[PDB]
Amino acid sequence: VITTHESAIRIISKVGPLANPADRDHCLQYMTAVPLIFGDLVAEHYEDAFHAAHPLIDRLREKMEIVEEPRYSREYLEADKRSIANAVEVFFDDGSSTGQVAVEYPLGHRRRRAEGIPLLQEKFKANLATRFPPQRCQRIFDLCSHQASLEATPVNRFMDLLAI
Amino acid sequence: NRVGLDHVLLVKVASTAVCAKLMGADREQLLAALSHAFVDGQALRTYRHAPNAGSRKSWAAGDATSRGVRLADIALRGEMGIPGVLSAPQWGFYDVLFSHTSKDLATKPEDKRRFSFPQGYGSYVMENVLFKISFPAEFHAQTAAEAAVRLHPLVKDRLQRISRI
């Protein structure tokens, strides 16, 4: 059972076959089933090769009941919250179940700024490293790290660091 | 000289260090640059010796100081260094290039297969440099030639009357 909000149901709730990664990219059941099975979710999982390799994705997708929580849909809209909420619960053939695991705010949300910022900075560091060698990556990260220093930097000199 | 290498590698090393400094290098970049100056190829001095002597003797230094700028630039771009470039057994500068004498192909004693120094670095050389401001002459003959210009009016007339110098 996936308890979710009205926008997710409308935009990414998809039953049946998924042709390309774009389908899987925008299919809540897929993005719920894969992490349920492999403890993770990366771009590699949106691959037709990975999809076929494991028929358990669709077994679980076919077992997925989507239910709207009125609260979730309301708090999605309220300007004091802007929730984006999903509760997931897993039931077993013998009648037992996990609990219901509810996460109402994603890591990139203001309410989790404290935990998200470490991840934002690591993501910046990885992306810098696909383009610049290590010492330039260090100069760029170090400059962007210090509010007062970055603010006093001339724009032309900031753009100097990012060329080639 | 004694290992068959031209002395312009010293231009290459001195210019790598001073140019990296002017360009803002820190310690790690400057050591990287210095090590590349040393791993680099070092020109022979064939072009300073008959019967193969020629105008490369006049521009080897320019080409070495040019290479110093290029290596400093490579270090400032972030290139990693080569830390044992001198001392690495078999592959290093000392073993490959400073360990044999070229006049007779002999192997130096192990004790002389490294750079030796009688003093550190300060400002001694510039203070003590030689300028060519006198006679077009080899330096070891400058004082003899200037002695003879003074002695010239004293032996000017008695030219034929000279027996021994």
- Rounded Cα distance, A111 and A14, in Å: 29
* A135 interfacial to chain B (CB closer than 8 Å): yes
Contact A15, A29 (CB under 8 A): yes
Q: Which domain holds residue A41?
A: 1-107
Q: Which residue, A84, A39, A32, A81, is CA-closest to A61?
A: A32
**Which residues from A are below 8 Å from B24, CB to CB?**
none
Indicate the helix (H) or strand (E) that contains B42.
none
Specify the resolution in Å. Answer: 2.4
Sheet order of strands, A66-68 included = A66-68, A2-4, A86-91, A97-103
Residues facing A85 on adjacent strands:
none
* B77 interfacial to chain A (CB closer than 8 Å): yes
Tokens of A141: 């990260």
**Which residues from B are below 8 Å from A135, CB to CB?**
78
- Rounded Cα distance, B68 and A27, in Å: 59
Q: Which technique was the structure solved with, according to the deposited record?
A: X-ray
Cα angle A36, A41, A44; round to 5: 125
Burial class (CB in 10 A: 0-12, 13-18, 19+), B5: middle
Angstrom distances, CA of residue A9 to CA of A26, A65, A74, B88: 11, 11, 14, 67
CA dihedral B15, B20, B22, B25 (to 10 degrees): -160
Contact A21, A49 (CB under 8 A): no
SS3 content of chain A, % helix, strand, coil (to 5): 55, 10, 30
* B24 interfacial to chain A (CB closer than 8 Å): no
- Rounded Cα distance, A28 and A41, in Å: 12
